[model samples]
Structures are given as structure tokens and as C-alpha cells.
Target chain A: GEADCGLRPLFEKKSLEDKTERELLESYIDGR
Target chain B: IVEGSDAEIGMSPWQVMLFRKSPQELLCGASLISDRWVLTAAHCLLYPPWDKNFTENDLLVRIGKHSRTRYEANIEKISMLEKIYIHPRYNWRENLDRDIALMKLKKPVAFSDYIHPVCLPDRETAASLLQAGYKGRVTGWGNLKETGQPSVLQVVNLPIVERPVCKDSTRIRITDNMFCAGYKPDEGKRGDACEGDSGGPFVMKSPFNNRWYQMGIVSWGEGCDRDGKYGFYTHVFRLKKWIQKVIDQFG
Candidate 1:
């Protein structure tokens, strides 16, 4: 399994991996 | 597809937007199959940690929506989840195999010009109509770039890529239940499904019936319209029986 696998959820989380969940979800939901 | 044009109202009446109920954040796309049932990708049921911290109550499905922000009370209908049935075989770990899911609404919706169920085709009809090179229209509000999801519904036409070719296109093992639908990554600025598009509808017009049938559900892709890569979907026809069973028991 050497294919850069990451569970591959197609829904966009974008690049807020470091932001708080509130900020991240707001960015996507409200396009903030 | 992310890089698609804006979809006119009622273009994809079966399209439904998936969201988290509390803060009301958009998650994935699902398609109406009945007054009470909508089809989606199984993987979308999980939360950020990939599981837990979520249940049936966290889910919300909105039907008859076009603009992500501009909502008309008459056209839009919202429903909380009654039950969510994920395919038992979906390997959320590997993220493939029987990747379809269903969410039953607490209340059934009435049909209107702005809201309707996508036609479900039998296995034989789906197989014949969805052969290689068939172009199906897919609609979504997924991200076009790597940043934010689009503000309006988008539509694009993606042709079915043959299974063998799709398998060879990426490192992820394309399972039998998955259908390949996209242009060759190098096929001249073609639009494709991106993140936030998982579980969206893939529909094609039937020449025989003059109606659109749901053929696939957005699953995964290596990148958005990347060269040599293609988008993959859960073949609805392969899971047609399972959908019927779920509706019969739940609906």
C-alpha cells in the first residue's frame, strides 16, 4: 500500500488542518 | 465537477446537499431516489476524526437547492435524518468497495418542478446505457481549486472511462463496484469532481425513455482534472438491489 493513501474522503476539507474545527467548518459552509 | 458552469434552477432536481446539523456546514452531496430516501457515498457518514462524535442526528439533507446561499423557501426543503444505512461492505479504512449509502428522511417530501427523485434504472438498463464513452452529466458544489467550495451549483459532462483504463490510472485499486467517469487527465481543460463532491449524482439522459437516470455516485479521485488521472464513482447499477432493499425496509 505504497500509494500515498490517506483514506481518500472526496469531500473538501481544503487545507485547514491546523485551524480550529469552527473556523474550518465555517470556511466551507459559509464560504467565509 | 468543480470547473463546470453554473447550473440553472431545476437542472438537477434530484441533487441534495449534505450538511452537519448543528453549525450547518456542507459536507457531501446526495441524490433523491424517493420521497423519503436519498443516495450518497458511504464514506461521508464519518466526521473529522473519521468516526465517532457523530450519529444519525448530526446529518441533514437539503433538497431543491441551487445557489449555496440564495435559498427560496418555496423551492428548498430540509429534512433531518431518520436513519443512515451504510453499505456493510464499505471499507472506510481502505475507502472503497460498496461505497454507497442511504439516508432516510424523517418526513417524506412532496414532488414539484423544483424537487424530484432521480430515475433509478435496473441493472440491465444501467449497464447498457453506461457503457464506455457514454457522457453523463454530474452536478455539485464542490471546490474548484484547493481552497473553498463553490457558492453555486456546477454542472459538467464526463464520459465513462473503461474499467481497465480507470484501474490503471491511479494507485488506488479500482474495485468492481466503482465506475470510472472522466476525461483523460490530458484531455484539454476538462472539468472534474473535486473534494466536497463525494456522494454527488451522476445522471445520463436515456434516449429510449427521454428521462434522466442516476448512474453513479461521486466517490474519489486522485486530483481534480489532473493529467493522467480520472474521477471514480460508485456504480449505482451494481448497488440497485441493495438500495431497493433499504427503501423497502426503511421507507
Candidate 2:
């Protein structure tokens, strides 16, 4: 098993990953 | 989930390891060309569900040499890393040519065993047949799923493939600034770097000083590790002078 480094990064610190695919898609649409 | 204004975007605060652990997270590779800058494909910077633009301050890059889940070296605030420049002629729809970008860090990154700047091929040498006098090594943490599915975090090793062979089956036509290499078809049905492996290093070992030089920055390929099919890489030497120029000007 790979070791887990437990530190949060500034770039990925946002909840962007947590957003549903639909949410991300909507954000992309609205962002445009 | 946190929200913020345009002036203060809420960046993901988790390290790459954590981000990859979460099912929602995505994985992209970047090359540590210098202490304060990184090189990656513009496609990786594009938000999938979002627009096809790569703003200077939108994405982030993480650097770690060795360790599956170790934080020996990790940096954030890469959004502050200014976008030095992107290849003038890049078209995702058409050629997908020139898909390279350089970044300038707010501060210099410290080098260590698993973490160090890869040697770059000389501009003139790479352009010429000399090929920078380096043996090649390409790495990526891309999806390992074979059935056209995506994986989490995985790394693979590949030596330099010949330029002529690479050009034969590549999606983008060969350019003076672009050289390619990868396993030939038949080695595996679907091999070589793929979607999640954008922006890694196509490193080569040089005979002159026995040092590893970066000849290409991984950009794209039809499939990972597949034979015959070649992956496209941004020529290192072509951008060598420009990278130095930008560093001196911006840094």
C-alpha cells in the first residue's frame, strides 16, 4: 500500500473536486 | 464546499495524495523544470466541465519525487505562479499542436533526492540531430485502467523512441520544436501515457556529463503504453531560451 501524506494544498484546497459532475459542468457553463 | 469571490478563489487545500484519495479528485502530472517554475500541457489546465481557457492564475502544480503517499515536498499557492507563455499555435480541435506552457513560481522550490530540476536539452542540439546527447526517460502518474477506463495514481517508465517512428503514427505532425518517442504498437494493446498523464517529463540521459536531460514535456497520445502509436511531447530545447528569458524577466 502507498503511504498517505496528510497535508492540504492551496490549489486543490477548494471543494472543486467535491462538486458533482453536474455541478462542475454547470460551473463551466456559467463561467463561460 | 467553500465559495469565494473572484478576487479570492477557494483553492483546494488538500495535498495531491488526499485529493487523489477522494473519489471526486483528479490527477495530472507536471514537470519541475526549475525551482520556481513547472511545465505541463495546457489541456491539463483546462477545467473539464468548465471552459477551454488557461488563465495565468487558475490552476496549481505539485512536485514530489519519491513516495506513494509522502509529503516530503509539497507546495501550494501555485496559482501565484505566473504563466510565462504558451506555444503560439495551439489548437485542441485541429492539430493539438504546441500544447506546452511554462510557469513561474512565487518562490524557488528546494531540490532534494526525489525532487530536483531535470536537465534540459540544448536548444541548438535538440533542433539538430545531436538530440542533446542524453538518454531518454518519460514518467507519468496516469490512469492504469486498460479497458479504456481511468485509474487513480500510477507511474510508468519508457525510454526514448525514434523521431521518425514517432511521427508516423502521431496525432500531430512533427515540427522542428516537437520530437516524440514511446513503445511501438503490439507491445500492448493500449500502452504509453494517456489522458491523466499530461505534462510529465520526457527525460533523456546525456552522455557528455552522465546527467539526465529533459528533452520533451509529455503532451498527448492516443493511448498509454500502446505500441506503434506515439505520444506527442513539447520539444524542450525549442523552449529552452524562452524559458530562461522569461525566468530572468519575471523572476
Candidate 3:
């Protein structure tokens, strides 16, 4: 039912709901 | 793997140094994908908050040198940046999803045992690598200690973190375009990529051919060698098609 790397299913999966402003900004500043 | 051991000569031939012209300093790490092409992080070229606004003339790419402090004979090559390409969707304001970029060298490099290109895996190869649960080798001249950057290259063996685990730990949206790898806290030790390490390759040894394949690119992380926190990388497998398109146009 799944491809070897589980990639196909991952591709088939839908995107998450739109990210909040806070959530979006947090991702950028959190990393080096 | 050895925490911070000096890399063997020619051990990580594809490892590259990106130098900013104005200040004449090592800016970021990169990998040689082809004789004329280099792969690195977009932030290295355009980090606005840091006032990093670089053009082609403002950068230099150096490859094949192991130690930044000592000169190794006949192993170093430097090239001028001919052109640069960043993913169109890369928006630092949003996230580091499309955080990858490619740079074309002004001239082709002559390859040697101490200077070689790393293989870029196809979609199938990338899937197979993920399925294998492989440990990857990440090499860099990044910070060996919090106080300063290392003059010699350092390497560590890191395990791939599943998407869900990474998302939970980071508490940030881990898109399919991104994946993470690092030592878990429970493992009692920590290994990670840090500042100045961005744009280096996370390579996995191929079971089929024994050659290493570039699976990930150093993109970002919360901190270096911290427990529970892992380093995020741009998933090269997911970006394979986009890479091909850019390479076809530029290379």
C-alpha cells in the first residue's frame, strides 16, 4: 500500500491549514 | 561520528567555503555538485536582517582544502561566482522551506582525489535512502565551540529524524520539503550543524554503489549540539526536479 520510502503517500497527503502570522515568523527566526 | 575529529585529506572533497568579498570572510559552507555548479543555502546570499546583500561579484567559492588555517598542498581551488540562482518561492519571512540555491563557477574546476563533486540523488534514490534509515556524514568548518569558528573541518554522524518527531520537537511546521537529523537527547550525547555550517551537504553512503549521495543541505537549526533539538535540512530529494530545471538552465 505504500512506496518504499513512503514518499508517494507523503506526496498524496494534503497541505496543512494556513499558518498563523506568529507560526510563520517563528520558523524563520528560530534557526541559525 | 567522532564528534569533532579532523577530516582526513580528501575525505569530504565536495565541502566548499563561501567567502563574502566586502569583508573577505568565510560566510557559509557549500558543496560541489558539478565542476561548474555549487549548492548552498539561500540565506547565505541574502540575509537581510544581517545586511547580507551579495551579488555575483561579491562572492568566491573555494573547494578541496581541509584545514582553513594550514595550507594543504595541491588540494585547494578557488573560483569566482559567475551566476547565482535561488528558489523563486524562497521567502525568509515565511520559513526555510525552499532554502536552497545554486551558484555557477566562472570556470570549470579540475577534479582530483582531493576535489570531487558529490552525487545528487534522484527521487527514487532519495526514497531508498530514507527507507534504509541511514546515518549521514555532515562535515563543516562551523563553530566547534560557541566562541569561535573552527579552522579545521569537523564531522559528525547524525541519524535522520522522522518528519512527525521533528515537527513535534521543533513545534514548528515541518513541511515535506524539509527533513531533520541529529543525535537525540536520550542518546546522552549531541551532534548538530551550527552557524557557518549552512549550505553544506548531508551525505549518505549508497548501499548499491558505495558512493555517497547528497541527501540534504544544511539549512537551519535551533542551536548546536543541544538535547532534543535537531538540525533542519532542505530535502534535496523533494527538490530534485527543481534542481534539474535550474541546472539545465545554468549549467
Top model number, DockQ: 2
Task: Give the Cα error of residue B25 in candidate 2, in Å.
Answer: 3.3
Can you write out model 3's per-residue Cα lDDT over B125-149, one digit (the tens) per residue? Answer: 6867763234677888888744366
Misplaced by over 4 Å in model 1 are: A1-32, B47-49
What would you estimate as the lDDT of candidate 2?
A: 0.48
**Candidate 3's residue-wise lDDT over A1-32, tens digit each?**
11221111112122212112122123223322
Give all candidates' CA lDDT scores.
Answer: 0.74, 0.48, 0.74
Q: Candidates' TM-scores? A: 0.84, 0.64, 0.84
lDDT tens readout by residue for model 2, B109-157: 5643234455556644354322321224444445553333222234333
Candidate 3 runs further than 4 Å off = A1-32, B131-133
* Docking class for candidate 1: incorrect
Off by over 4 Å in 2: A1-32, B1-24, B46-50, B54-57, B65-84, B123-135, B146-164, B170-172, B185-191
* Alpha-carbon deviation at B129 in model 2, angstroms: 7.8
Per-model interface RMSD values are 18.6, 16.0, 16.0
How far off is residue B122 in model 3, in Å?
0.8
